[PDB]
């Protein structure tokens, strides 16, 4: 309750950025970092490739 | 060809010229039944022409072909490309006739299936 | 003399690979991804619509 996701999007923003947020948390799959194998069908990539071609940018804030 | 009632109709006229002019018009309509009949008939024989003729198209390319054409030569991407990736790094004999293997099961199986793409990452 | 009137072959036919060669123009592209995609591209071609590996050519491509 301080405002770190806030003051994060108003960095975001201030510096024209891209955002993207991302919660690690109690996490224990390193395959959302790291994605799937591409083999097995459906098996999606990192959540960092997601955010690369959600924020169309090389220079996002994640 | 019209049918009975309208010889009947057109005896039940009475002067001349409306029992011609019935007359006429079946004969008009015998027309039009015979060139309706011969305009379907010529139109589905041109349609099947054409349908022999698409084997016989596929009959050109397929001498073109013989000319100049994939049959003939066999024909493996993976192969190809994995071989000329491993030809010019000196190569021990064990992981090539592994590599040989594994292309030959990768042959062996369809290009569909999941042990066909597990066998391609390994290869990789 | 090949190309005279076949339906079959005319289709499937510069649809995808354009696609993703005009969706690639604007990017400065590494080197790289350029061959794995090339090839990708070649293979696909050499693949069919119904092929469960070009599905997967055409997700990892995409």
Same mark, same amino acid.
């Given at each position: 309750?301080?405002?770190?996701?806030?003051? $994060?999007?108003?960095?975001?923003? #201030?510096?024209?950025?891209?955002?993207?947020?991302?919660?690690?948390?109690?996490?224990?799959?390193?395959?959302?970092?790291?994605?799937?194998?591409?083999?097995?069908?459906? #098996?999606?990539?990192?959540?960092?490739?997601?955010?690369?071609?959600?924020?169309?940018?090389?220079?996002?804030?994640? | 060809?019209?049918?009975?009632?309208?010889?009947?109709?057109?005896?039940?006229?009475?002067?001349?010229?409306?029992?011609?002019?019935? $007359?006429?018009?079946?004969?008009?309509?015998?027309?039009?039944?015979?060139?309706?009949?011969?305009?379907?008939?010529?139109?589905?024989?041109?349609?099947?022409?054409?349908?022999?003729?698409?084997?016989?198209?596929?009959?050109?390319?397929?001498?073109?072909?013989?000319?100049?054409?994939?049959?003939?030569?066999?024909?493996? $991407?993976?192969?190809?490309?994995?071989?000329?990736?491993?030809?010019?790094?000196?190569?021990?004999?064990?992981?090539?006739?592994?590599?040989?293997?594994?292309?030959?099961?990768?042959?062996?199986?369809?290009?569909?299936?999941?042990?066909?793409?597990?066998?391609?990452?390994?290869?990789?």
């Amino acid at each position: 309750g301080v405002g770190k996701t806030s003051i $994060a999007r108003s960095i975001a923003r #201030a510096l024209n950025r891209e955002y993207f947020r991302f919660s690690v948390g109690g996490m224990t799959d390193v395959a959302e970092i790291k994605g799937h194998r591409r083999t097995y069908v459906g #098996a999606m990539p990192g959540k960092i490739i997601q955010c690369l071609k959600k924020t169309k940018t090389e220079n996002p804030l994640i | 060809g019209a049918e009975s009632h309208e010889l009947q109709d057109v005896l039940e006229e009475t002067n001349i010229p409306k029992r011609l002019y019935k $007359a006429l018009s079946l004969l008009k309509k015998e027309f039009e039944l015979s060139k309706l009949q011969q305009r379907l008939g010529r139109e589905v024989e041109e349609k099947i022409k054409q349908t022999h003729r698409k084997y016989l198209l596929q009959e050109q390319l397929k001498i073109i072909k013989k000319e100049l054409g994939l049959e003939k030569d066999d024909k493996d $991407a993976i192969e190809e490309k994995f071989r000329e990736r491993l030809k010019e790094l000196v190569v021990p004999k064990h992981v090539m006739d592994v590599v040989d293997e594994e292309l030959s099961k990768l042959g062996l199986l369809d290009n569909h299936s999941s042990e066909f793409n597990v066998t391609r990452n390994y290869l990789d």
